[PDB]
Amino acid sequence: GTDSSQGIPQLVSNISACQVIAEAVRTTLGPRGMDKLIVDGRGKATISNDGATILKLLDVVHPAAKTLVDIAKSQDAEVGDGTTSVTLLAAEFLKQVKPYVEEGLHPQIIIRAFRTATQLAVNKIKEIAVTVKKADKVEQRKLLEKCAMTALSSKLISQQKAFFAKMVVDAVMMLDDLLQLKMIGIKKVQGGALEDSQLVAGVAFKKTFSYAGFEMQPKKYHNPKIALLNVELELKAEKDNAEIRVHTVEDYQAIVDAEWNILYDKLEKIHHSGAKVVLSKLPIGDVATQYFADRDMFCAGRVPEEDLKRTMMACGGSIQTSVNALSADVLGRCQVFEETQIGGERYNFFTGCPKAKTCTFILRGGAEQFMEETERSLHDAIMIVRRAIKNDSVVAGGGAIEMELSKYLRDYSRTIPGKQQLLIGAYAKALEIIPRQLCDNAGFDATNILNKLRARHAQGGTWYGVDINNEDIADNFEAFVWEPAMVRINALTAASEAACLIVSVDETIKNPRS
Amino acid sequence: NAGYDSADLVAQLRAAHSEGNTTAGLDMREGTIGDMAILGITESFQVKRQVLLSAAEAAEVILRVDNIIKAA
Amino acid sequence: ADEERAETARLTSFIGAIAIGDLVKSTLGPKGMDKILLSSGRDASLMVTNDGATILKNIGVDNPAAKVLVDMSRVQDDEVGDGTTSVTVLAAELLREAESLIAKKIHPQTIIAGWREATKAAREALLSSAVDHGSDEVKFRQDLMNIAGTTLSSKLLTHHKDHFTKLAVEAVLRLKGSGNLEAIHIIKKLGGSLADSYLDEGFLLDKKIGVNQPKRIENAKILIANTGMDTDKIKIFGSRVRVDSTAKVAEIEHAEKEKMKEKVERILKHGINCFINRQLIYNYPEQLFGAAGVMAIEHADFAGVERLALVTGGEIASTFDHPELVKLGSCKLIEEVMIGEDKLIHFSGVALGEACTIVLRGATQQILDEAERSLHDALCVLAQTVKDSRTVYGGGCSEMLMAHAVTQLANRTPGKEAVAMESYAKALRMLPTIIADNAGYDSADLVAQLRAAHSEGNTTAGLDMREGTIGDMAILGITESFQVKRQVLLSAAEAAEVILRVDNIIKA
Amino acid sequence: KSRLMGLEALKSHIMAAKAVANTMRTSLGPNGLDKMMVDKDGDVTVTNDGATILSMMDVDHQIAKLMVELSKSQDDEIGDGTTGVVVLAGALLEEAEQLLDRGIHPIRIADGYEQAARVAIEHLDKISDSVLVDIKDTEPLIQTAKTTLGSKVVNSCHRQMAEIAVNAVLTVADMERRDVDFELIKVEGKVGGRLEDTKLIKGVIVDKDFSHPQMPKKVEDAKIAILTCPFEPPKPKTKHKLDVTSVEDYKALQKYEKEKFEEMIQQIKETGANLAICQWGFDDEANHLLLQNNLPAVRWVGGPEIELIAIATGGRIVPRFSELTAEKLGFAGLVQEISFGTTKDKMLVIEQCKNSRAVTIFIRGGNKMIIEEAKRSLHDALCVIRNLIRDNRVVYGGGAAEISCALAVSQEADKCPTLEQYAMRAFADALEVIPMALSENSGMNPIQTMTEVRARQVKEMNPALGIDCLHKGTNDMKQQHVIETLIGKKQQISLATQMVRMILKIDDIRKPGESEE
Secondary structure: OOEOOOHHHHHHHHHHHHHHHHHHHHOOOOOOOOOOOEEEOOOEEEOOOOHHHHHHHOOOOOHHHHHHHHHHHHHHHHOOOOOOHHHHHHHHHHHHHHHHHHOOOOOOOHHHHHHHHHHHHHHHHHHHOEEHHHHOOOOOOHHHHHHHHHHHHHHOOOOOHHHHHHHHHHHHOOOOOOOOOOOOOEEEOOOOOOOOEEEEOOEEEOOOOOOOOOOOOOOEEOOOEEEEEOOOEOOOOOOOOOOOOOOOOOOHHHHHHHHHHHHHHHHHHHHOOOOOEEEEOOOEOHHHHHHHHHOOOEEEOOOOHHHHHHHHHHOOOOOOOOOOOOOOOOOEEOOEEEEEEEOOEEEEEEEOOOOOOOOEEEEOOOOOHHHHHHHHHHHHHHHHHHHHHHOOEEEEOOOHHHHHHHHHHHHHHHHOOOOOHHHHHHHHHHHOHHHHHHHHOOOOOHHHHHHHHHHHHHHOOOOEEEEOOOOEEEEOOOOOOEEEHHHHHHHHHHHHHHHHHHHHOOOOOEOOOO | OOOOOHHHHHHHHHHHHHHOOOOEEEEOOOOEEEEOOOOOOOOOHHHHHHHHHHHHHHHHHHHHOOOOOOOO | OEEEOHHHHHHHHHHHHHHHHHHHOOOOOOOOOOEEEEEOOOOOEEEEEOOHHHHHHOOOOOOHHHHHHHHHHHHHHHHOOOHHHHHHHHHHHHHHHHHHHHHOOOOHHHHHHHHHHHHHHHHHHHHHOOEEOOOOHHHHHHHHHHHHHHHOOOOOOOOHHHHHHHHHHHHHHOOOOOOOOOEOOEEEEOOOOOOOEEEOOOEEEOOOOOOOOOOOEEEEEEEEOOOOOOOOOOOOOOOOOOOOOOOHHHHHHHHHOHHHHHHHHHHHOOOOOEEEOOOOOOHHHHHHHHHHOOEEEOOOOHHHHHHHHHHHOOOOOOOOOOOOOOOOEEEEEEEEEEEOOEEEEEEEOOOOOOEOOEEEEOOOHHHHHHHHHHHHHHHHHHHHHHHOOEEEOOOOHHHHHHHHHHHHHHHHOOOOOHHHHHHHHHHHOOOOHHHHHHHOOOHHHHHOHHHHHHHHOOOOEEEEOOOOEEEEOOOOOOOEEHHHHHHHHHHHHHHHHHHHHOOOEEEO | OOOOOOHHHHHHHHHHHHHHHHHHOOOOOOOOOOEEEEOOOOOEEEEOOHHHHHHHOOOOOHHHHHHHHHHHHHHHHOOOOOOHHHHHHHHHHHHHHHHHHHOOOHHHHHHHHHHHHHHHHHHHHHOOOOOOOOOOOHHHHHHHHHHHHHHHOOOOOOHHHHHHHOHHHHHHHOOOOOOOOOOOEEEEEOOOOOOOOEEEEOOEEEEOOOOOOOOOOOOOOOOEEEEOOOOOOOOOOOOOOOOOOOHHHHHHHHHHHHHHHHHHHHHHHOOOOOEEEOOOOOOOHHHHHHHHOOOOEEOOOOOOHHHHHHHHHOOOOEOOOOOOOOOOOOOOOEEEOOEEOOOOEEEEEEEOOOOOOOEEEEEOOOOHHHHHHHHHHHHHHHHHHHHHHHOOOEEOOOOHHHHHHHHHHHHHHHHOOOOOHHHHHHHHHHHOHHHHHHHHOOOOOHHHHHHHHHHHHHHOOOOOOOOOOOOOOOOOOOOOOOOEEHHHHHHHHHHHHHHHHHOOOOOOOOOOOOOOO
């Protein structure tokens, strides 16, 4: 058969289910905002911040649950920050229309009230937005330091932010025209320059195999030929396993040697095809490791795959799963090879790359859990500054505009309505919930905090928001809390859209009968 | 009554009178061992000789009454 | 997935001990009753068990705290003897006492220390009563006769106890400086009398002389080797393959008779009729060895050459590759004696030293099995008399000697630990409680009366519960080694304190 | 779908944390009562270490599932102190309910718990001066490993173990910028002889093979032939076919292979390294023939055993019989043979003065059960010394520094007077739970125990005079010699406030029926 139910009791079932699913992604996003923990399937426990990460991970038990995924996916694909905020605001629309539709007051002018209030919002955001790359420097890289140092002062650190911000700025300027996370990735040790990080403009390798000989091999070059392999190298090559044989005397010493001639012949296939440094994802054999010491070549197995993806983009090479190469544009090469054991862990540093687009931070904190937050402290400054470059049209962050836009659109609720003040008022009601939640995930009384802001919004200024590191009212422009304008404009057009989807649809039809 | 480790203070006081430290028992205001033969806590001879007499007496009388009959 | 809280894990530790301590406390002491093992989990059988190892191992404990008790009582029985029985009760007797401390809410660490220093207090009082009776030779003769009367007791024997007594006492006194634990051998076989146990002048191998072989070999020159055969002898570089159908199964079973003839050609070149081998033969090889003139003596072992090594003066050796690597044997007369129901060959000659061979006679396997461990307990303990001629009053008379002095040290020395030191000494006096009902005497009139009595004078006066009365422990001969009583204390004290430190059982 | 909001979240956060903190507080110190474990295979296991048991216990809650990785960070870095981070962080946690029952918001205390962790770490810089010279500070570590050994695995302190263990670390620290790597050292334990037997091996050990005592049992010059190539016929666990034409052909074959035995000698011996070791094994027939032919050979060598001798020597391995050089041979400092155990056989000890890439303390046992319990005491003693060799920062912990920072953080709730004062109060009273717990599992009254050294803080600040747990009645830390590393205690501050921070990280407590299912 086929499952189907029509109308308001299905529609009330529609509006109520989506709000409960939104209860996680409502209450997230920041240093005083939130950071995840779920258990799915086998018991695989993961930790996130983006809901759109875990909305792909969590199940969908409603069509309303299916509605939230792509809308969160749309926010995560562009920015990567504020992925949950679109899924916040959509169900927050449904809460104040819920007493209306349960009275029976259900227009389909509800959905055009979303779009009309959207156009008044997204125009007001754009006309109040200021291009900062053009107006507020000609070089705009010291400008990006004050935004990144603010992004470092938010999560964990308050003294390392001056030492780290220029390393963030000099890394992003290389990564411009790109937005990769495996090309800004941060590596972690304790035992190097402690509470100091470094920026390399090339390709660094975290997990490289040693303890089978690294001082018996030349650990540095000045023209490396990088074999980006994925083939397991054995301790010894094999013979057959059917009618394989030992004791008598004639064919005896040969078959023990014949296990060994086949291995180094395949290792020579790497050598004369062009290789001085060889990397493999699968483990390189320990007796095979010393054969690279025989040809005086560096080698390391047990390599993560994401490390090999850095090399193919900066050298112009490629990864391989073969034993013989045919070109140096599939192979990797640089102009300086250098192995450096920072923190007791073997790093392969690729400097002098032909492109050098990949940037990598070798992070040393004061501890391990300290360095976990320190990496995500640095990661916030990478996310916001790449976003600040791609859109110069930048407003303040922290929902500072929304509280102004809350009062701005209730003035239209004073102005326009035939019945529309119920809708635009509910539209403006849901806008202040985001800095309310940003006070509420910070734990403190938004009713004290938000209400003080609207008084200074009443005189003039929209950049008045919350400095969440102290939880006080603050002009987030002059408190350096920013985010570009189109981010909210992309957020508003997607939050109203799924809200338009819920109001238009009162029925869910399941044709294979669940 | 003083609200202390009774198992400690008895076994401490048991260690006292074992060799014969009899001139000192526990001053219960701190529960610590203190002076006797007048302290404020050194009690009357006439009291305990009556208390030892009656408590040993009636408890054996309770052991005598096993044939209890209730007719009320 | 189960983390069990301390309040049940402590309770499991006590009910794990009580449910096993009552099993053997019938069999402890002079044992007025026994333990009857009932077989229904494996087969339909019935076992009369005074052996605690039969009680502990054949009834696998399912209390994990009781698993510690079975294991530490096992090693005590292995080295010293009579260790599964004594250690397990005394540990179980302590843990009944420790519940009252937890009922009074005593710190468990106090209970750990409280039994520990009192164990040190007991062994010194046990050492004060330790007195030599193996001083002179007539004393050392009558020392071991009374102790072997005690150690062979508390088990089921018909008439065996007195003859296993006077045999082993002769074995210990002949060495004069060590016990015989090196090359004496306990041979158990089917006999017709329930009383006989005699020492061998020489040593014996299992060889029933059959088909045409002679009964007595004289002027022996023994070729000692490890190479042998059972039914199989393939060629050195050749083979025979006879399978292509279902009629070849009968012909491949008929080829095993012709395999037996090739090994006989090897011994025939030697000309040595005294060839021993570790492997056995049947009626089918035996017609072939004796027909060549070289006799195959099977069921050999390392124990026979080792017994020949000490008295005669040779060495024990093995790995027969060339005959100069195995030390050969020499004997005067090889005669076949008939012991019990069984015919065995016997290499008779020089004897009576560091090495003997003890042969046992009994038609019942159950009587032979209990007589092994009962003799196995004493030979170590009679060797402990060579180590320490200090004997101590068996039957619980030495038990009250320790409970007398620990109780005094439980009063004076501690300041909080007296409640934990007394639970030691009260559990010491629980040992005469489990035996007074076995003889029928009132346990309450036993445990306090004689403890003050022999300690204040005549320590020899002790528990004669073969009468249900008080008797003298050196006049009635009821005394054992100081060493056996010393070792069973420490195993009983530790295992209780080990599972007392257990305050989190977790079952994954 | 059931959502356990706020307090209803925290009640789930209480019960697992209440369970795991109570099982640790019965296990602090040498008076710590042991932890029993029945495995998932139904196997009795008795330790006293939390990082063992938290790895062994099947965790069934978000609090409990956290504690595997939380105690992973402590034991890999510091070692001992697995119990104290659980007792402390749960004691903040149960107090945080009382604050939430007082109406104090769970966020403002989680904000203040981090700042309360700052002023405690600030206090440890003042506590217990950090200068201990290299020859002297071995002796308190000789005293510290005396405490770990002399009360837990062996009642009376193997003296040879605690003094070798401080010597293995200086073998690697000097080559490694005053720091030790835990893969350059290894706690190697093999029973078979005596439990008193304990050795330090600068390289690795292999059991030395001799087939007959009539054949010469040799040991010679400090150079090892780390070989995989055949010096003696090898065995890769299979079978050919055997065929000879005549018996006299086999009579000549023994004379033929004897020249082939000498050829394997004259190739290796002219390169050096007279101790030949080949990976694949052989019987004892041609083994004692090579012993008669005057070079010893070790047979039936384990697979990775040829690698660990290679890095210990620093040299390579000879892959093939035709490729022959000395750089593929071992570079050893001393090759001498010492008997394995006391009764069974002999080893070949290959020491190096060149490369400390595998410095293995080698202990023996007369019991299989005691040695991993002995090694677990040795695992944590070799981790605390890593803290000292970098910086000589020490702490007098066990009841002195616990009451000392509990004075300070409670003072810092008054010096820094704002909202986090109850968070600092929840930090300060939880610090008192620890020396209570050293006396709680002890036979002493812990209520009396917190009183005494509190009066000593009125007497003296920065105490080297805290409680005892040996019941000697001498409450010190410098004459009771209960001293630990300052880095280790400071790490315990970071880890305990990490967990309370970790359970505060999202506001999501809703499930689809599956968030712990």
